Design goal:
Two copies of one chain form a homodimer. Chain A is α+β, with helices and mostly antiparallel strands and 255 residues long. Chain A has two domains: 144 residues, Phosphatidylinositol Transfer Protein Sec14p (3-Layer(aba) Sandwich); 111 residues, Pleckstrin-homology domain (PH domain)/Phosphotyrosine-binding domain (PTB) (PH-domain like, Roll), CATH 2.30.29. Chain A has eight helices and 14 strands. In chain A, the strands form three sheets. In chain A, strands 11-8-7-6-14-13-12 form a seven-stranded antiparallel β-sheet, with helices on one face. A five-stranded mixed β-sheet of chain A has the order 1-2-3-4-5. In chain A, strand 2, helix 2 and strand 3 form a beta-alpha-beta unit. Chain A starts with a helix and ends in a 5-residue tail after the last helix. At the A-B interface, helix 7 of A face helix 8 of B. Chain A: It comes from Homo sapiens (Human). Chain A: It is found in: Nucleus; Nucleus, Nucleolus; Cell membrane. Chain A: Stimulates the GTPase activity of Ras. NF1 shows greater affinity for Ras GAP, but lower specific activity. May be a regulator of Ras activity. Chain A: This is Neurofibromin.
Amino acid sequence: KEEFKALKTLSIFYQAGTSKAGNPIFYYVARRFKTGQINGDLLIYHVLLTLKPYYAKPYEIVVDLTHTGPSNRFKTDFLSKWFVVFPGFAYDNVSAVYIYNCNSWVREYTKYHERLLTGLSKRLVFIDCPGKLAEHIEHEQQKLPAATLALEEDLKVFHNALKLAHKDTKVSIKVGSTAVQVTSAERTKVLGQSVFLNDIYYASEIEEICLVDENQFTLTIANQGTPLTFMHQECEAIVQSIIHIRTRWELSQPD
Amino acid sequence: KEEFKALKTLSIFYQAGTSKAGNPIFYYVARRFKTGQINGDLLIYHVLLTLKPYYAKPYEIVVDLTHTGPSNRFKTDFLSKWFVVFPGFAYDNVSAVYIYNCNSWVREYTKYHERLLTGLKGSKRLVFIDCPGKLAEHIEHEQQKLPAATLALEEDLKVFHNALKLAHKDTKVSIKVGSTAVQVTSAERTKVLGQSVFLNDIYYASEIEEICLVDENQFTLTIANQGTPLTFMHQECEAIVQSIIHIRTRWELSQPD
């Protein structure tokens, strides 16, 4: 009764709204699940009791993947457990699954767990732009977490950047007051589908900001051994942006 | 060596500038020391080694008491050790101690440890400072170097001027709401170590647990880890609450996952 009550306050999984096709919607906020902190069974049970009143009828799911990383992963055994516990009709009634803010780590996780994720049917809809969600759920019916919605406000956008790696990738770098977002300007495949990835780095994860030259800068990210390196005609302006953002953050942290 | 080297990185005690009387200036940032988490002797050693080159000649200290509370206290035996660990001349050589942002808790700490602070009460060398400007006056052509976090609390402030903090004894205060904190600055003076000063209590958006509008003229603030809630009276309470709710919401929207 202790930890279970808590999962509801957390808002990891909750019902809210109705889709344009008339089905109740549920939101799964991936970053709120902490692999080693929260007990798997409790989450499964909380999801179960939330969906139970509805899953004998058509329903839809919005998976909010913003900022989802290894600390939010479903371990191999837990992942497969998810596909066995709910009755069969429960899985059959999911009319659509909307994937929001899919990113590089999640893409790798799906490749590694590819054998199992095969089940996911033209039911998977990747929302490559916060606007396209409207094409399925009227704006006023939407209930993505306020903290997710906040990441889209007051962005300074730099198009035509190039992320350097074994394979270079064209990207847009977006600096907001609390985070840096690097969005692919080219599609990759995630589960057989072509989508735009959106990697998010909170000011609090940016350990170092280096300006190499007029058109190249790097970012050292907590828990990532290799720096992120980018090229752009306005790298000093991009570096200034990120420095201001991280400085405003540091000046607001606990004593 | 790995634990000691970190103290310099924490920026608790640092040198910066020269007074108008021509003496180096050192900054002690009170809120940056956390009792029961930092070997007390290590702070003394870090302070000792940074004053060593200068304490044989007159020097000055700026103590930033911004947001200082019980988690930053000098325990009795540690507070005592600070009076016996330095070379005699090192104390006499302290030409002045500027005290910035003294607050209610520090005032109480001072009454409670009155016995060990006797030699500070009524000292001509303790100068209580109101704003970064008055401190800069004593420093070379106004070149104060208070921590940037302290100076950020000073800008873009919405100020409510004639509020009344309610208690057994009511207090005239001005309520200031900034993007990251709320400040309650006394309008009347009180004694601290024998001097009549203004107190500035600071509450970070993160400590603001609950906000309640009582009447059109009254609101309450519940601060984390402080039992008694704060209650104020003022004609524009609806607006004071609206402004603090905004500041709190923005903070909540940025917490970790």
